[PDB]
């Protein structure tokens, strides 16, 4: 259910080589909050990969601490998938967390590396979140 304390979800970005603005994945509910993958080009140059939590809510009282593994799937060999871990207290003023320079853009879009296929790149997030505060009283 949506009250699950953890989950793994993915978001495949299409026409990746042409990405110019930030893209957001549909929500994946964990601890009954909407979590989303955020991808954006940073400085061509590098891939911005962030995890966002409850960004739409106009509430300023919520907070949820979570740890997560951010991974860019390598379709040819999952052991080659690249991932970084994060730990962060999400709240309205810091509703997303990740790396502006998660991977070199030239590496991810290199057709010989196994991360891109038909100009599509798959991102994955494994998030483990504690019970939230200031949401369900």
């Amino acid at each position: 259910t949506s009250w699950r304390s953890e989950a793994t979800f993915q978001f495949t970005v299409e026409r990746f080589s042409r990405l110019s603005e930030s893209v957001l994945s549909p929500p994946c509910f964990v601890r009954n909050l909407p979590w989303k993958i955020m991808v954006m080009p940073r400085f061509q140059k590098s891939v911005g990969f962030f995890l966002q939590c409850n960004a739409e809510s106009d509430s300023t009282s919520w907070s949820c601490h979570a740890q997560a593994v951010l991974k860019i799937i390598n379709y040819r060999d999952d052991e080659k998938s690249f991932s970084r871990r994060i730990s962060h207290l999400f709240f309205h003023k810091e509703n997303d967390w990740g790396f502006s320079n998660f991977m070199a853009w030239s590496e991810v879009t290199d057709p010989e590396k196994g991360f891109i296929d038909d100009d599509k790149v798959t991102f994955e997030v494994f998030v483990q979140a504690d019970a939230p505060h200031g949401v369900a009283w």
Binding site: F50, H88, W97, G98, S100
Partner: peptide
């Protein structure tokens, strides 16, 4: 190190 997107 990690951080926010903005």
């Amino acid at each position: 190190e990690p951080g926010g997107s903005r």
